Amino acid sequence: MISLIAALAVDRVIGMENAMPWNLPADLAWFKRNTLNKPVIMGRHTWESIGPGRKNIILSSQPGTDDRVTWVKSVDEAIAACGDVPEIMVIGGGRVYEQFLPKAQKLYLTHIDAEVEGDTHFPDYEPDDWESVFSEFHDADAQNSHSYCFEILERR
Amino acid sequence: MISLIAALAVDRVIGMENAMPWNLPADLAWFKRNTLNKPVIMGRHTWESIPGRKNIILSSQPGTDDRVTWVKSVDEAIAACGDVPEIMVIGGGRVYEQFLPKAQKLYLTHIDAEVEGDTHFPDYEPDDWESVFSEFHDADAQNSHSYCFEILERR
Ligand SMILES: NC(=O)c1ccc[n+]([C@@H]2O[C@H](COP(=O)([O-])OP(=O)(O)OC[C@H]3O[C@@H](n4cnc5c(N)ncnc54)[C@H](OP(=O)(O)O)[C@@H]3O)[C@@H](O)[C@H]2O)c1
Ligand SMILES: NC(=O)c1ccc[n+]([C@@H]2O[C@H](COP(=O)([O-])OP(=O)(O)OC[C@H]3O[C@@H](n4cnc5c(N)ncnc54)[C@H](OP(=O)(O)O)[C@@H]3O)[C@@H](O)[C@H]2O)c1
């Protein structure tokens, strides 16, 4: 199966011109929990932002620039590179989420109570086509700059 | 001599109820550049938020980590640093307020972020401080806000 994992500010904003204006180690821990050694697919801009671990599959139209990870030139090649696994984790960014949302069976979302003027958004999903199977709200604290809610949705 | 090092949002905000809403690895690298192995003094809340050098923690209560040095007063904090060229006071608000009158140098990162804080860097009169270094940086893929490193020396 294919899953998407993303952290959304209000209006489904996921990315800005620069690094996101928050500090959420709990979200980093949740991201790790839910990826572990599973194959990940990401776009080239997300790869440049995160600086590797599992299979790391990077989408780019151009030849790859780091032989430690696997570079692919299409969605189909990305899926093929992950092989026959229980769950593929699509980790961003906006252009990649848009292409994989119709293929996805599960969303792992972190809803962050932050308003940020973004340039990239998580794709529109119709909540009626998705069953919320898990939800956990957390307050901001000494380590986390904003309140946040982890949610898992499974396609209906 | 005593120096303060701090990261200031607008209105001299240094701290909030919760973690600061920014991601500034360049400021962490600057903080390291300017501390390295020099003794550091910090308040107990800053200790809990963040050991390496001498790490001197102010608290009214017995210490809870024997890997660092705990002191109950400003004068003991200074004494615990020994005879060194530069003591780095790293926060927080209560600690900066007590050490500012003793300080000869400020290492400030001015961050272009507006945040409603609960704690501020102490008032200083810029006329009483000479800016000896200033370096501006844009936000980028790793740093959420633009920032300016500044070093002031007491005139
Ligand atoms: N998303 C884009 O295509 C694109 C283009 C120009 C500027 N930007 C800016 O970059 C920032 C991040 O955007 P984002 O979150 O959308 O980035 P992202 O998903 O992390 O990465 C997008 C990149 O992934 C590669 N890619 C995605 N789908 C592909 C496919 N089917 N075949 C081959 N390569 C594919 C392209 O790399 P290559 O560029 O190496 O081909 C693309 O530019 C935004 O501010 C956006 O405006 C994005
Ligand atoms: N981050 C956290 O852990 C946390 C938790 C609760 C509240 N706060 C609140 O957050 C706000 C900002 O704190 P801040 O930046 O001012 O904290 P800070 O300077 O990092 O730490 C202040 C602490 O340092 C100790 N201290 C400072 N001067 C001292 C002296 N002369 N003698 C003995 N002990 C001394 C006291 O510890 P003791 O308290 O151990 O005596 C004091 O509470 C404050 O309103 C604070 O009360 C922060």
Side-chain angles (χ1 to χ4, degrees), chain B residues 2 39-43 54-59 69-82 84 87-89 95 98-99 102:
Chain B
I2 291 166
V40 297
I41 297 174
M42 68 195 90
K54 300 171 196 144
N55 297 277
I56 304 321
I57 322 306
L58 279 154
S59 176
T69 302
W70 296 77
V71 297
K72 297 185 175 89
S73 69
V74 167
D75 294 337
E76 285 164 32
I78 296 168
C81 292
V84 302
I87 293 172
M88 301 299 293
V89 174
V95 175
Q98 293 168 92
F99 279 90
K102 307 181 181 298

Side-chain angles (χ1 to χ4, degrees), chain B residues 89-105:
Chain B
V89 174
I90 71 167
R94 184 180 164 189
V95 175
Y96 295 134
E97 181 189 320
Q98 293 168 92
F99 279 90
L100 179 64
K102 307 181 181 298
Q104 303 309 308
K105 193 163 183 192

Side-chain angles (χ1 to χ4, degrees), chain A residues 31-122:
Chain A
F31 174 87
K32 292 188 192 168
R33 227 139 54 236
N34 287 296
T35 49
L36 297 171
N37 299 261
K38 292 173 201 176
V40 297
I41 298 173
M42 69 193 90
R44 191 255 303 171
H45 290 292
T46 292
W47 165 251
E48 287 183 354
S49 285
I50 71 177
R54 62 164 176 252
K55 297 193 167 174
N56 301 275
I57 310 309
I58 321 307
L59 279 153
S60 176
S61 64
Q62 301 308 300
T65 52
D66 192 327
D67 288 346
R68 293 168 309 160
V69 298
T70 303
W71 295 78
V72 297
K73 296 187 171 84
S74 68
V75 167
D76 289 332
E77 282 171 26
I79 293 164
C82 292
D84 187 352
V85 298
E87 186 174 22
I88 296 167
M89 300 301 293
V90 175
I91 70 165
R95 178 176 168 195
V96 173
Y97 294 135
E98 293 173 354
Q99 292 166 93
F100 280 92
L101 177 66
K103 307 184 179 303
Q105 283 295 334
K106 193 163 184 191
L107 311 176
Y108 301 74
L109 303 180
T110 308
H111 302 292
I112 302 155
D113 297 302
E115 189 172 61
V116 303
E117 275 300 337
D119 68 0
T120 302
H121 301 81
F122 193 78

Side-chain angles (χ1 to χ4, degrees), chain B residues 3 15 27 29 38 43 48 50-51 53 57 68-69 74 83 88 102 111 115 117 123 137:
Chain B
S3 297
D27 174 64
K38 298 166 201 162
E48 289 185 355
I50 76 179
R53 62 160 165 261
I57 322 306
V68 297
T69 302
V74 167
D83 197 350
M88 301 299 293
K102 307 181 181 298
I111 301 158
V115 298
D123 267 3
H137 299 276

